[PDB]
Amino acid sequence: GVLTESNKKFLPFQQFGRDIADTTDAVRDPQTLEILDITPCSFGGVSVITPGTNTSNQVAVLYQDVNCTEVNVFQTRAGCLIGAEHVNNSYECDIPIGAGICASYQTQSIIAYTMSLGAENSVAYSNNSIAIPTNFTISVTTEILPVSMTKTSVDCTMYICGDS
Amino acid sequence: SLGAENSVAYSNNSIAIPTNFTISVTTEILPVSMTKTSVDCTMYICGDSTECSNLLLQYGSFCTQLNRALTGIAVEQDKNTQEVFAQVKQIYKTPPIKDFGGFNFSQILPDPSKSKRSPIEDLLFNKVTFNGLTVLPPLLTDEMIAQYTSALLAGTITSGWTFGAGPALQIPFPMQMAYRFNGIGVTQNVLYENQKLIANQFNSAIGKIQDSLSSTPSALGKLQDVVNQNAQALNTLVKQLSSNFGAISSVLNDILSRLDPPEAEVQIDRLITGRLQSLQTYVTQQLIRAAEIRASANLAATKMSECVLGQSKRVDFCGKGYHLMSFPQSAPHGVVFLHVTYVPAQEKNFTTAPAICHDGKAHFPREGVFVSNGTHWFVTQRNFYEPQIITTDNTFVSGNCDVVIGIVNNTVYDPLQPELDS
Amino acid sequence: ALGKLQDVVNQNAQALNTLVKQLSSNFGAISSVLNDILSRLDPPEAEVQIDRLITGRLQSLQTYVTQQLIRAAEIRASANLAATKMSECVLGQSKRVDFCGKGYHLMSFPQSAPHGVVFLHVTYVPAQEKNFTTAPAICHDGKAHFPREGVFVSNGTHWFVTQRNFYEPQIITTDNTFVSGNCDVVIGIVNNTVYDPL
């Protein structure tokens, strides 16, 4: 872990502190009676933001929840992103990263931009104004719904130990 | 006590018709998303000790199944939020001035003085309050969730129910409320002729809802309950790393600092079984909980589409009373709906008859009911008392008088007679 | 396009593949293959290793059955929604918004699909909007006149009453407006002339 001086006051008899999960959180140095805190080292999952292998083979990486001061470098609230650059143009969401930032392959590199909620439209409002449609467009849409899943069965005796 | 006893008089000739109404704004709170928490199986079960990991790899896919399940829950939370809130193809905006014919919406619209969130949403936000585990951030921030709620309110105020079915068509707000009354069965003269009272009632109700939320701290119980359940479950998972599970010590480093491989391995195995069982129980509880939250998100998306983006004919689905129009509000991990309902109020009991006979014919009310003030007869709408003279415009004819049971004799005025006699 | 059905098949197959693959793990014993464990060790020392293998396999089976019961409940919720669409959207016409396509629902047609149903939602959509001036009611004889099923609209030279969802202008007769009250109470009332068929 990483050791840093701890302000925790140890009574004259006990030496090392304990956390809720029974892992030492603070210890007192044997040579000098000083109180130190034990903090676990930086840890976090790493995710790759990959445009499909057909489109390209360059891939950026996302270090989850670990600011990358421990080793183009965009620090987001989802971690810091390496391999992709911040942009000021907001586009529709293609790859979701988190905290409202999304990345996609643009034409070439990977760009991480603020996600775009959608277009903006202000409808003329007045106390005496109305809009009435004049034509129409019949439209057909599709809704796909799962209805059943394959009916499987497992023999417990044969699976656990077959023919014994 | 189940409820207040109240028996209602019934008679074969009696009717009771409303005479005045009370606009009412009620509230509904629904959980829409959970917290996207992921727990690493190896870094929780075997704490950075390779001697433990080598034993762990012999338990097959148990480590990766739990990660896969938790990832599924975490993605589903984002899908739930997108489904409930992202129902708009455009981000509509309010007009700069607020000439809504007497309706003050300051308590629901976004306020620029502050994060731009409505005065109701601020009160909502304020009220709601090992190495393996981490919390992932939501895809949609609270600012964007408020933008979508702002868009839905702005469309439902300026363009009415037309924005959700196609292009947004503007409408004057009082006309929009008149169509909503005409929807619930009440003619639009009633709104046009009581506009000040209806605006006053609506403004007072919306103002009262803010105090109601503040006065009771337990209004947001559903959202708080969801947050507490998740937190407690994670806390129990962290606590289970303090149990020996039949070994000599819970601490892995100590149990490896005091024994040789042949003797350390048996104790490690005992811990691996216990910790893997505890994590597996946690993952299964999270899958069940996610499923109930998914049902609440699907219900919330249905209420948003069927109630905010239109008018619902479904009883009790958007508040007690007839539903006129609803307003969504964001909340932490949830959505709060504001249902505006028209409630009948001052009932007056009048006598009634199925049909009236004038010239050997039976007349039936075109829309409305037959009532008497005790002496004369009048036909009035079922959901309001606006008594009207029985002309032949508001009734139709079918049959001889004897067939209907309860037929009464009266005079049906005919507009033809005066202009034909002259 | 058929992502939902594909996901259902992919998830179920991945669960079966993991359940079968877990039979290759020794779970802390000395060999996955039961025959080797039984033969290499004498019966009284073979039994404890077999017990460890049985426990691991039984836990893998229990994890599979629990995950399937959860998945099946999600499928049942989707099947119930499909039944509600097949009842309230193809066997009838639904007033409910967004239940059957983003638009006004006219009619729907079902289509089969492997382990699923696909619905074809035919929806009317308003198309070319145009801006007209409106007024709540018109006053002609010192009386109000409210539209019966339409909206008052004016191109600047006349007043017509038209359907709310289609622009078909029509004359303001007394056949389509009902009378209630006088000029003062209704806000914004516009004085105009209502023709009569008499």
Q: How far apart are CA C188 and CA B174, in angstroms?
A: 11
Experimental approach: cryo-EM
Q: How far apart are CA B180 and CA B161, in angstroms?
A: 10
Q: What is the least distance, in Å, from the CA of B235 to any CA of chain C?
A: 23
Cβ burial, residue A144 (10 Å; 0-12/13-18/19+): middle
Q: What is the least distance, in Å, from the CA of A164 to any CA of chain C?
A: 8
Cβ burial, residue B405 (10 Å; 0-12/13-18/19+): exposed
Strand residue runs (E) in chain C: 104-113, 116-124, 129-133, 138-139, 144-147, 151-153, 160-162, 177-178, 190-191
CA distances to B149, B151, B245, B254 from B328, rounded to whole Å, are 6, 10, 49, 55
**Stretch 113-172 of chain B: residues touching chain A, C-beta under 8 Å:** 130-131, 134, 136-141, 143-144, 147-148, 151, 155, 158-159, 163, 166-172
Of B134, B135, B66, nearest in space to B278 by CA: B66
- Specify which residues B347 forms β-bridges with: B18
Q: How far apart are the first and last CA of chain C?
A: 61
Phi, psi of A60 (to 5 degrees): -85, 165
Phi, psi of B148 (to 5 degrees): -70, -40
The sign of the CA dihedral B414, B416, B419, B422 is: negative
Q: Amino acid identity of C20?
A: V
**Stretch 28-47 of chain A: residues touching chain B, C-beta under 8 Å:** 40, 43-45
CA torsion, points C123, B318, B200, B101, in degrees to nearest 10?
-10
CA angle (C130, C135, C140) in 5-degree steps = 130
Q: Which residues contact B365 (CB under 8 A, 6 or more apart)?
A: B379, B394, B395
**Resolution (in Å) of the shown entry?**
3.8
Q: What is the least distance, in Å, from the CA of B368 to any CA of chain A?
A: 30
Q: Which residues contact B260 (CB under 8 A, 6 or more apart)?
A: none
Q: How far apart are CA B240 and CA A83, in angstroms?
A: 39
Residue bearing tokens 């959202």? B223
Contact between B85 and B300 under an 8 Å Cβ cutoff? The reply is no
Chain B residue with Cα closest to C152: B175
- Reported as type and span, the H/E element at residue B349 is strand B347-351
Nearest by CB to A159, which of C61, C71, C132? Answer: C61
A94: tokens are 């293609």
Q: Are strands A2-5 and A35-39 parallel, antiparallel or unpaired?
A: antiparallel
Q: How far apart are CA B149 and CA B143, in angstroms?
A: 10
Query: CB-based contact (8 Å) between A158 and chain C?
Result: no
Q: How far apart are CA B275 and CA B267, in angstroms?
A: 12
Q: How far apart are CA B391 and CA C178, in angstroms?
A: 12
Nearest by CB to C131, which of A131, A140, A159? Answer: A131
Q: How far apart are the first and last CA of chain A?
A: 50
Q: Amino acid identity of A72?
A: N
Q: What single-letter DSSP state applies at residue C115?
A: T
Of A138, B165, A145, A141, nearest in space to C120 by CA: A141
C97: tokens are 């918004």
Q: How far apart are CA B26 and CA B303, in angstroms?
A: 14
Chain B residue with Cα closest to C153: B171
Residue bearing tokens 């903090």? A39
CA B133 vs. chain centroid, Å, equals 33
Q: Which residues contact A63 (CB under 8 A, 6 or more apart)?
A: A44, A46, A79, A80, A82
Task: Give the neighbours of chain C: at least 3 Cβ pairs within 8 Å.
Answer: A, B
A43: tokens are 């840890």
Q: Amino acid identity of C47?
A: E
CA distances to A142, A160, B218, C143, C159 from B58, rounded to whole Å, are 47, 17, 49, 90, 84
Q: Which residues contact A19 (CB under 8 A, 6 or more apart)?
A: A25, B130
**H helices, E strands: number in chain A:** 1, 14
Contact B170 A23 (CB under 8 A): no
Q: How far apart are CA A6 and CA A14, in angstroms?
A: 15
Contact A96 B175 (CB under 8 A): no
Q: How many residues does chain B have?
A: 422
Of B174, B202, B189, nearest in space to B343 by CA: B202
Contact A147 C165 (CB under 8 A): no
Q: Are strands B356-357 and B36-39 parallel, antiparallel or unpaired?
A: unpaired
Q: How far apart are CA B270 and CA B281, in angstroms?
A: 17
Q: How far apart are CA B381 and CA C111, in angstroms?
A: 45
Of A124, A116, A90, C135, nearest in space to B154 by CA: A124
Q: How far apart are CA B186 and CA B346, in angstroms?
A: 15
CA distances to B186, B346, B375, B381 from B10, rounded to whole Å, are 24, 18, 21, 20
Q: How far apart are the first and last CA of chain B?
A: 68
- Reported as type and span, the H/E element at residue C81 is helix C43-88
